[PDB]
A paper describes a structure:
The dehydratase (DH) domain within type 1 modular PKSs is responsible for the dehydration of specific C-3 hydroxyacyl-acyl carrier protein (ACP) intermediates, resulting in a corresponding enoyl-ACP. Here, we present the crystal structures of the borrelidin DH domain from module 3 (BorA DH M3) and the [name] ([name] DH M1) at 1.80 Å and 2.01 Å, respectively. The DH monomers from both BorA DH M3 and [name] DH M1 possess the traditional double-hotdog fold with an invariant His/Asp catalytic dyad. Within each DH monomer, the substrate-binding cavity contains (1) a hydrophobic tunnel/phosphopantetheine (PPant)-binding region, (2) a catalytic region and (3) an acyl intermediate-binding region.
Residue numbers in the entry:
A (entry chain B): 25 to 47, 49 to 243, 245 to 300, 307 to 311
B (entry chain A): 25 to 312
């Protein structure tokens, strides 16, 4: 009704607030973030530089898909980092094309501050074509997986270069079985309190990625290309994570809640680092 | 602001409240909403018992979107589909503006819908930044040689012809005729005068500026604005205006609008009206 009073459709999301139907046209969803209204934002980055997490673009792209009946995120490549400076407000736009005749829509995420030019930070494809989801869990912790000591894992990433403040220090337990890694990940109470409003809170899905850096440790490397991403259940505060390599050279991830019920499936996640590297 | 909290830009206008820049190489869309409850003058323009959004409202919408992209001049606008206002149901408005070409010209379109109906395009045209060199403010008012006209029965005549002009749209107060030219003074009712400052030009004021042109032709039948060319708004928020209408060689009318001190307000190079088919938008009258 805020949005409705402007002639648009209200969106009830912590980061997106209005939907603008274009008349073939497609659709645009808009929103505004900052470290005042999303304090967890200040806890993710590279050194002193803050970066909107890759998992936030996944959350945004899936939520736009929900609005057009295309919840499956078939593909998503991340292009430019979204540097957030201080408590500057950041305008967000998620642009969704009309459906092609193959059913697929293109999705894009743009952002800017002030009147500086918009920059495209994410681009991919949305569909309603769904893959059959991975079965639910049973035995936890999984049989034959050895418990790993992550007691000081966030310090190993603190001097490697990663910038994970308290909201993104989610990894609590991990195990290794062969090339598989298992993990328990949970939000702090502050982000836990907001979690119910998201598809999957961006800080929780990011921290679900942290245990993959246990099997093979490569400097700083961040999610880059996602493939076959489906959110299965919403509002999670704590999750279990099952990560495996693909023979495509990437990582599969199957996310469940504390009862083993599916939360999220990621068919493949490629990550990449980055003149001169850091140390 | 409201629009700011949604990640958009606010627009301060009575009918449009938000500007959404479309990054990519697309342009802009401005959005708003209207209803007889928030815009009571809507109820006072139509044909028969059918409330119709005034074509001048589309001129106002298109020009306001032009200002938002630094393209203030309405080079051309064609009205495509009438917009019926059904009771007090709200109407969603969208004004789409393209990226400028190499010419510096932008395409503009106005869409509307109520409830969950599909959008309908009501107006399409072209904005430019090119301004016309202004027309002379030469003032004896009224001009020499102009003969006063009794307009006391004018709106009663227009009613009998078929026009539906309620109180907010009965702004024609005085008129003079010289050759095939008409001069008019037009004033908003107090209710519309109070909100006129926020408009580029109140749609009810611009529409009544068109009422004096029928005094020469005395056309049988109802006709509504259809095509506009060279619409420049030179001064915003007028309540009372002077009007100078004359034909062009197109079968069209030009109009130059000044304020009550003779200063420029708006210029319309060409306006074409089109006859309304009996039985099109309201029922036909009953034969006698």
């Amino acid at each position: 009704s805020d949005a409705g009073g402007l002639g648009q459709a209200a969106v009830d999301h912590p980061m997106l607030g209005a939907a603008v139907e274009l008349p073939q046209g497609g659709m645009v969803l808009t929103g505004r973030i900052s470290t005042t209204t999303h304090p967890w934002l200040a806890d993710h980055g590279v050194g002193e530089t803050v970066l909107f997490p890759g998992t936030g673009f996944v959350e945004l792209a899936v939520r736009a898909g929900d609005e057009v009946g295309c919840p499956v995120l078939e593909e998503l490549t991340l292009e430019a980092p979204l540097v957030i400076e201080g408590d500057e407000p950041v305008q967000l736009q998620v642009a969704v094309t009309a459906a092609g005749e193959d059913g697929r829509r293109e999705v894009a995420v743009h952002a800017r501050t002030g009147q500086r030019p918009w920059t495209r930070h994410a681009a991919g494809t949305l569909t309603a074509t769904s893959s059959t989801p991975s079965p639910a869990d049973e035995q936890w912790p999984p049989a034959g997986a050895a418990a790993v000591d992550v007691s000081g894992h966030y310090e190993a990433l603190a001097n490697t270069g990663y910038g994970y403040g308290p909201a993104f220090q989610g990894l609590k337990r991990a195990w290794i079985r062969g090339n598989e890694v298992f993990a328990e990940v949970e939000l702090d109470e502050r982000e836990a309190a907001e979690a119910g409003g998201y598809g999957i809170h961006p800080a929780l899905l990011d921290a679900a990625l942290h245990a993959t850096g246990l099997i093979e440790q490569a400097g700083v490397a961040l999610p880059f290309a996602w493939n076959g991403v489906e959110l299965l259940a919403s509002g999670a505060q704590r999750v279990r994570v099952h990560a495996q390599p693909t023979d495509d050279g990437a990582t599969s991830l199957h996310i469940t809640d504390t009862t083993g019920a599916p939360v999220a499936g990621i068919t493949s996640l490629i990550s990449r680092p980055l003149s001169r590297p850091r140390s």
